[PDB]
């Protein structure tokens, strides 16, 4: 399901980045195993205060019936929830109901992320919620 070369790479890049490398590795690997349309890569994330930070991100298309997304896993995961943006890469900007769910900061306002409990939630659940996002009206 997940090439061993990817598993080894995943374990490798996670160690120097995450406070909780065991949970980050378990949850991210489980996610890749469950959703073959998703892939991992690390990229430098630029925070609002200008600080750059290399983080693991998972990207690809998720089904809603589909939307391209980039999910970021914060270094404090799971104490802090992941965050997701629509992946505009390569799209002909001349295009979404999903837009009504995107907050002013450009993140998808997934309910579960605002009602986050670091002891009973994982990345797989996050993607599951994304798949049903349109079933409820945009909160705030």
């Amino acid at each position: 399901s997940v090439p061993e070369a990817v598993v080894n790479w995943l374990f490798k890049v996670i160690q120097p980045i995450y406070n909780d490398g065991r949970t980050t590795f378990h949850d991210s690997l489980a996610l890749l195993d469950n959703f073959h349309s998703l892939r991992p890569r690390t990229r430098v994330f630029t925070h609002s205060d200008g600080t750059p930070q290399l983080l693991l991100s998972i990207y690809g298309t998720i089904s809603t019936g589909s939307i391209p997304v980039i999910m970021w896993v914060p270094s404090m995961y799971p104490v802090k929830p992941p965050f997701i943006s629509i992946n505009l890469e390569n799209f002909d900007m001349n295009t979404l109901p999903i837009q009504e769910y995107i907050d002013s900061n450009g993140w998808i306002a997934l309910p579960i992320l605002h009602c986050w409990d670091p002891a009973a939630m994982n990345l797989i659940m996050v993607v599951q919620e994304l798949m049903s996002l349109l079933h409820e009206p945009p909160q705030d």
């Binding site: 925070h47 200008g50 970021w72 943006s85 837009q99 002013s104 900061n105 450009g106």
Partner: protein, 74 residues
Amino acid sequence: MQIFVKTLTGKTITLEVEPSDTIENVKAKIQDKEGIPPDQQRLIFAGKQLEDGRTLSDYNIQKESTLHLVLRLR
């Protein structure tokens, strides 16, 4: 179209822009309101530092979006 630009000092800025406006044009508008030279400006949105040559539309920045500004001396 209205968008906001938040600064490190908690200060917020309001700008009138078009989706086709380039990042460079947006920096020019910021200079007009705050007197800050474009060269000192770094605009950030959703984890990315924005590129002068691209447009707001290119980053899917919609009305009411909040961009962050940080200044740097080159």
